[PDB]
């Protein structure tokens, strides 16, 4: 196609068309869409941000391209280098709340890796691992295990929803709820296409499988891996895998994620905490239980409106437009049989072991007045525990999508600071976020997901995307929370396209030495700067800061 809405920096219309006709040459017209609609969670947009905070055409592509295979990524990269054309690599593009598929720089080509590079490449039982392409979603992998009856030997680890990409998510450092919840840390053996176009495989993925007749003459992308590849991440020398998570260092084509074997015994559960300030005693209780391993998985401490919103929109609870009051929160708590804060967990293993742990657990949370213990069966048909019962055993759902519909044309945006595992700190962080949320006229809706020694605080800001005024209120809230949290010693672990620079300016110890050194490595390997300029505040030398930061 011919005249796009936005073009990339310094490129001419004649240049765009020579490039696109070249890309059409390589991947067929069926795999290249020019842009001369927000969609859903089932048919994800690939051109812009669907949960749009800035204007709707603010972060938008010039064309979308779907490589049919690894060589196609090599061809497109050389062309991007020929013309200086910035690319934006997505796997599924389901990063809503962080931008979705949109490119940080308008005019880029979005690289739809997933549409054709789809395959579960290997599921190895003795190694208890799998090897996946960008396009394998969580659901997809789950159906792969079920079609080969692997469900009885190996389990998955899913975030809250089922449409994400196993790899896309893992390269973002996302989180899940089984004992294998730190997705990125369960990776081992990635394959990458660099900016120059060369294929690289990490760790022991660099040790080649020995020559044998059946594998002779296969292109590099299509060769097998040597035995240790997906069993030990480190290989030899500098361990470079992290330069490929939350970065613009290369295009990820394949990855190995470790799978947890069926533990032969599972029991999900729910502890309800009666009052808004029981968060302080609860987090003090979780600390030693987490650190001592009575708490096997990644427990979540959810805020009442988070469960409530799954169950119904705000109009269904009050016709009010201002933030619901404290007492209306207590009111909803009791209608659902939930507390003010809800703790979701699970016990894994033989009966004998679960029993002892569940006893210490119950017994510890008993020192909190009015506390109450529930297993799925003890709760309503539509409950959140019934849904998390599947979530905490690797089975993918879609139910939690409904909280996004809290307000009319609801869109979410995550504010994700990290806090210690201490009641005092947790309260202090919540205090600070609640106050700003009220000032902007928004209900506070969050959850803490409990790591070993840290807590991911996901403040879930939901808002009406057709409201100009509130869209500006959310932009004012987001930046204010970034800054206040920084003045209290907390940083965010992940963000949306528009807060990237700001959030990265926050990590400025010693005069910004952490971004400086990121800038050096990025120019070294990406001299024409075509691989995702902007990602995480890291800009190649030819994109001036003054012109592009936000």
Kindly tell me which of 89 and 299 has the beta carbon lying closer to ligand FCR. 299
Q: How many CB atoms are located within 10 Å of the residue 149 CB?
A: 8
**Centroid of chain to Cα 528:** 28
> What does the buried/exposed string (b/e) look like for 117-145 if buried means 16 or more CB atoms within 10 Å of the residue's CB?
beebeebeeebbbbbbbbbbbbbbbbebb
Q: How far is CA 378 from each of CA 243, 264, 337, 364, 387, rounded to the nearest angstrom?
A: 46, 22, 11, 21, 13
- Residue 93 near ligand FAD by CB under 6 A: yes
**Binding partner of residue 350 among a copy of itself, ligand FAD, ligand FCR, none, CB under 5 to 8 Å per kind?**
a copy of itself
Angle at 277 between CA 276 and CA 281, to 5 degrees: 130
Q: What H or E segment, with its residue span, contains residue 374?
A: strand 372-374
Kindly tell me which of 128 and 401 has the beta carbon lying closer to a copy of itself. 128
DSSP letter for each residue of 228-266: GGGT-S--SSS--GGGGSSSSS-EEEEEEEE-EEP-S-E
Residues 334-373, mask of contacts with ligand FCR (x by CB under 6 A): ----------------------------------------
**Binding partner of residue 420 among ligand FAD, ligand FCR, a copy of itself, none, CB under 5 to 8 Å per kind?**
a copy of itself
Residues 115-174 touching ligand FCR, rule: CB under 6 A, are: 160, 174
Residues 373-402 touching ligand FAD, rule: CB under 6 A, are: 400-401
Residues 516-545 touching ligand FAD, rule: CB under 6 A, are: 535
Minimal distance, residue 331 CB to a copy of itself, in Å: 35
Minimal distance, residue 267 CB to a copy of itself, in Å: 16
DSSP letter for each residue of 482-510: HHHHHHTT--BS---TTTHHHHHHH--HH
Kindly tell me which of 401 and 428 has the beta carbon lying closer to a copy of itself. 428
DSSP letter for each residue of 89-103: EESS---TTTTTT--
Q: Which residue of 8, 97, 135, 256 would you call a contact of ligand FAD, by CB under 6 A?
A: 97
What is the C-alpha separation between 59 and 45, in angstroms, rounded?
A: 12
Minimal distance, residue 220 CB to ligand FAD, in Å: 17
Kindly tell me which of 246 and 379 has the beta carbon lying closer to a copy of itself. 246
Longest dimension (CA), the chain: 73
Contacts of 412 (CB under 8 A, 6+ apart): 51, 96, 97, 403, 404, 460, 461, 462, 463
- Residue 446 near ligand FAD by CB under 6 A: no
Contacts of 236 (CB under 8 A, 6+ apart): none
Minimal distance, residue 362 CB to ligand FAD, in Å: 26
Kindly tell me which of 8 and 163 has the beta carbon lying closer to ligand FCR. 163
Residues 239-268 touching ligand FAD, rule: CB under 6 A, are: 251-252
Residues 400-429 touching ligand FCR, rule: CB under 6 A, are: 414, 416
Active site residues: 98, 493-494
Q: Which residues are at the interface with ligand FAD (CB under 6 A)?
A: 89-97, 113, 134, 159-161, 164-165, 168-169, 171-172, 174-175, 251-252, 400-401, 404, 412, 535
């Amino acid at each position: 196609e011919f005249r796009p809405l936005t073009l990339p920096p310094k490129l001419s219309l004649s240049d765009f068309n020579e490039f696109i006709q070249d890309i059409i040459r390589i991947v067929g017209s069926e795999n290249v869409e020019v842009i001369s609609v927000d969609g859903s969670y089932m048919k994800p947009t690939h051109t812009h941000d669907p949960h749009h905070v800035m204007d709707q055409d603010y972060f938008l592509a010039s064309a979308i391209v779907a490589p049919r295979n690894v060589a196609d990524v090599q061809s497109i990269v050389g062309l991007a280098n020929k013309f200086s054309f910035p690319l934006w690599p997505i796997s599924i593009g389901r990063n809503s709340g962080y931008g979705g598929a949109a490119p940080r720089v308008s005019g880029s080509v979005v690289l739809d890796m997933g549409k054709n590079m789809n395959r579960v490449l290997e599921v190895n039982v003795e190694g208890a691992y799998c090897v996946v392409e960008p396009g394998v979603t969580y659901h997809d992998l789950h159906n792969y295990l079920e079609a080969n009856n692997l469900r009885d030997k190996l389990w998955l680890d899913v975030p809250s929803l089922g449409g994400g990409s196993v790899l896309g998510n893992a390269v973002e450092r996302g989180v899940g709820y089984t004992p294998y919840g730190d997705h990125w840390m369960m990776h081992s053996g990635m394959e990458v296409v660099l900016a120059n176009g060369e294929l690289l495989r990490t760790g022991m993925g660099a040790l080649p499988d020995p020559k044998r007749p059946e594998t002779m003459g296969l292109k590099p992308e299509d060769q097998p891996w040597s035995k240790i590849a997906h069993l030990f991440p480190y290989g030899f020398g500098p361990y470079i895998d992290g330069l490929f998570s939350q970065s613009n260092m290369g295009i990820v084509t394949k990855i190995g994620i470790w799978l947890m074997p069926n533990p032969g015994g599972y029991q999900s559960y729910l502890i309800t905490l009666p009052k808004d300030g029981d968060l302080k005693q609860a987090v003090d209780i979780i600390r030693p239980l987490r650190l001592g391993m009575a708490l096997q998985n990644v427990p979540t401490i959810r805020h009442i409106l988070l469960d409530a919103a799954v169950l119904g929109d705000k109009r269904s609870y009050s016709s009010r437009t201002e933030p619901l009051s404290d007492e209306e929160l207590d009111k909803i708590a009791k209608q659902l049989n939930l507390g003010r804060w809800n703790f979701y967990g699970a016990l894994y293993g033989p009966e004998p072991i679960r029993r002892v742990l569940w006893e210490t657990i119950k017994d510890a949370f008993s020192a909190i007045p009015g506390v109450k213990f529930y297993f799925p069966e003890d709760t309503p048909e539509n409950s959140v525990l019934r849904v998390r019962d599947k979530t905490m055993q690797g089975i993918p759902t879609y139910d939690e999508l409904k909280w996004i519909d809290w307000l009319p044309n609801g869109a979410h945006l995550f504010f994700s600071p990290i806090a210690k595992v201490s009641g005092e700190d947790a309260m202090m962080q919540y205090a600070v976020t609640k106050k700003r949320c009220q000032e902007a006229g928004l209900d506070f809706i969050g959850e803490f997901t409990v790591g070993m020694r840290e807590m991911h605080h996901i403040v879930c800001i939901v808002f009406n995307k057709k409201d100009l005024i509130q869209k500006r209120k959310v932009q004012w809230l987001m930046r204010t929370l970034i800054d206040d949290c920084a003045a209290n010693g907390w940083g965010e672990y992940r963000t949306h396209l528009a807060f990237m620079d700001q959030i990265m300016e926050t990590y400025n110890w010693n005069n910004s030495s952490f971004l400086r050194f990121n800038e050096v490595l990025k120019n070294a390997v990406d001299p024409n700067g075509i691989i995702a300029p902007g990602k995480s505040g890291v800009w190649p030398s030819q994109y001036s800061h003054v012109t592009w930061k936000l």
